[PDB]
Paper text:
In this study, two new extracellular bacterial AAOs from S. deajeonense and S. hiroshimensis (SdAAO and ShAAO) were produced as active proteins and biochemically and structurally characterized. For alcohol oxidation, FAD-AOx utilize the flavin cofactor as the hydride acceptor, which is regenerated upon reaction via aerobic oxidation, yielding H2O2 as the by-product. In both proteins, the FAD-binding domain consists of a five-stranded parallel β-sheet interrupted by a three-stranded antiparallel β-sheet that connects with two antiparallel β-strands, along with seven α-helices.
The two bacterial crystal structures were solved at a resolution of 2.0 Å, and each chain (A and B in SdAAO and A in ShAAO) shows one FAD molecule and one alcohol molecule in the active pocket (a hexane-1,6-diol (HEZ) molecule in SdAAO, and a triethylene glycol (PGE) molecule in ShAAO) derived from the corresponding crystallization conditions. Interestingly, both structures have a substrate analogue molecule bound in the active-site cavity, with the site being highly accessible. This internal cavity is located in front of the re side of the FAD isoalloxazine and flanked by V90, F468, H469, and H514 in SdAAO, and by F92, F455, H456, and H500 in ShAAO, similarly to that described for PeAAO. Thus, the position of H469 in SdAAO and H456 in ShAAO corresponds to the highly conserved active site histidine residue that activates alcohol substrate by proton abstraction during the reductive half-reaction in the majority of GMC oxidoreductases. In contrast, bacterial structures lack this protruding α-helix and the equivalent loops (compressing residues 353–364 and 356–379 in ShAAO and SdAAO, respectively) adopt a conformation that does not cover the entrance to the channel to the same extent as PeAAO does, creating wide and unblocked active sites, especially in SdAAO structure. Thus, the surface areas covering the access channel and active-site pocket were established to be approximately 2026 Å2 for SdAAO and 1383 Å2 for ShAAO considerably higher than the 903 Å2 estimated for PeAAO. Interestingly, the fully accessible catalytic tunnel of SdAAO is similar to that of previously described for the fungal AAO from T. thermophilus, despite significant differences in the general folding of both proteins, particularly in the substrate-binding domain which might be responsible for its lower catalytic efficiency. On the other hand, SdAAO preferentially oxidized aromatic primary alcohols, showing the highest activities with cinnamyl, 4-nitrobenzyl, and 4-bromobenzyl alcohols (390%, 255%, and 119%, respectively) which resembles the scope reported for fungal AAOs. Notably, SdAAO displayed greater affinity (up to a 326-fold lower Km) than ShAAO, which resulted in higher catalytic efficiencies for SdAAO across the panel, except for 2,4-hexadien-1-ol and 1-octanol, ranging from 30 to 286-fold higher efficiencies compared to those obtained for ShAAO.
Residue numbers in the entry: 1 to 534
Write the structure that this text describes.
Amino acid sequence: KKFDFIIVGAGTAGPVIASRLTEKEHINVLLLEAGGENTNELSRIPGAFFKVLGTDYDWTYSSVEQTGLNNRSIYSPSGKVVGGSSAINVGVWVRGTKEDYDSWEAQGAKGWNFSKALEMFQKIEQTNLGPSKYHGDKGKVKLTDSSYPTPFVHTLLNGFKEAGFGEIGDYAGENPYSIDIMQKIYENNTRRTPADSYLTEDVRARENLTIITHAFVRKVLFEGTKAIGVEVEIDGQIQNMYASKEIILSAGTFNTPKLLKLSGVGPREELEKFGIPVIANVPGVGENLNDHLMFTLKFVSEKNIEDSIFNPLSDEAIDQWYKNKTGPSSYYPGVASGFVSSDGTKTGADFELIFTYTHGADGTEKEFANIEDIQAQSGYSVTVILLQPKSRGQLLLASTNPYDAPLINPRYFSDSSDMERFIKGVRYTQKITKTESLEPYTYLAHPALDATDEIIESLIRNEASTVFHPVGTARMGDVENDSLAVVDSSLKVRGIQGLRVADASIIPAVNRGHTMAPVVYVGEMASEIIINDN
Ligand SMILES: Cc1cc2nc3c(=O)[nH]c(=O)nc-3n(C[C@H](O)[C@H](O)[C@H](O)COP(=O)(O)OP(=O)(O)OC[C@H]3O[C@@H](n4cnc5c(N)ncnc54)[C@H](O)[C@@H]3O)c2cc1C
């Protein structure tokens, strides 16, 4: 078979592009994926999916020790399956704000703005929040409200409003400073990924689309500065596969920059250190790594929270789910999210608050030391996320061995403003415990409501963790005027012909939200851009 395009990675973005490009009969596309098809049904259960973390569905990377996080190494999973990380995530669709999408253009990516995003979300989203200017009703990706067992969700929503944080309603709509029930990529309590949605039976039956799983790409092949193919391992043997038009990397934030560097596209000094011939000196490759951190405030209640205590991992729950897609396994505790402006300026949300109707305590919290049967007690939690960290890190090669994990270093809290703002965000959030709604349910707190800045800082450095939103290691921008931009507005890699990147790696900075939705946007955008070239 003769291919026009090879797409590396059938994750979140890659599948979109394979689906769109093969709408033209004459365009042959090869889609390569290191993992298998998404056949482990446990991964599709909203309340139990996380049991597949650490398995063959996961690359199981961790960060280098983080000096800003008390030298902790941060477990940094990513999907290894058709669906990529969208196959192993909570599945919340929290796309961000106007300023997020507009900022890409402002930093040199002409044509990438909120107006285009809205146009793409009409094609992407299938939600009962639509039809509207903000939401599609008939797009490819079905979105449903999180399922929950407890009426206490209403008390959380009311508490946010009572605290003065903002309104109850659609944070992805007209008023961003709102709290809502999060929608998720589930249909009938079963995960349906973008890949499921774009690579349907019909699409896969197209003669001009070839999908190979268990295909591990080791490097991109060149003739001069022109990308012509990939070296790929299929079932313990190596093949070279070729494209007559272009190679598209959709291997995600961690593996895309690794592949680029191994292939001779990256910072000259690092490549030369490893003896890798430099085909294009692109300093930006592997730079600008950024990610969100979350810190959870936990609250134990004396007052019962009805039907809040259940076990989504029990054999009875899981069976009930297999049988008729109901029961405890339907429920993920993180159900609502609100966006706030902690300094009142409303110039873009600065914090996200994610709410559960359980304390989420492990029992080793000092403030809960003397509580009996903590797990049987009622409570709630608010996870605070600093939405626009200034810290930037690196994705480096460990070696020239294609199988070796890349070295992931977000440099969390390396920019001093991050901790400064985070401490303020925690204190802002803690006001919610004073509301008429939530004061009745706030008996003990972690951190304590009277904790010093020093105690809060220490707890953040020891307990804050990735929200799984790495971006930025092949940043899209103005490659004429910005030495650290990697790809242009057309997603073409600088210094190279016939090579594009389309995945989270091109996203300049994390959004006010979660990264699955902007990644699907990138896939729809890449598709339109490529089709309009040809
Ligand atoms: C545990 C977890 C929870 C998350 N929760 C949410 C959430 O609820 N909502 C949200 O919006 N975001 C969430 N995210 C983030 C979001 O899922 C990702 O940002 C997004 O899916 C990344 O899309 P992508 O296409 O860039 O990469 P991926 O989805 O990681 O796709 C990359 C693909 O390339 C394949 N691949 C990589 N290297 C090679 C190679 N060399 N050869 C062949 N194939 C290769 C991978 O196997 C994979 O399928 C979560 C992430 C994780 C890990």
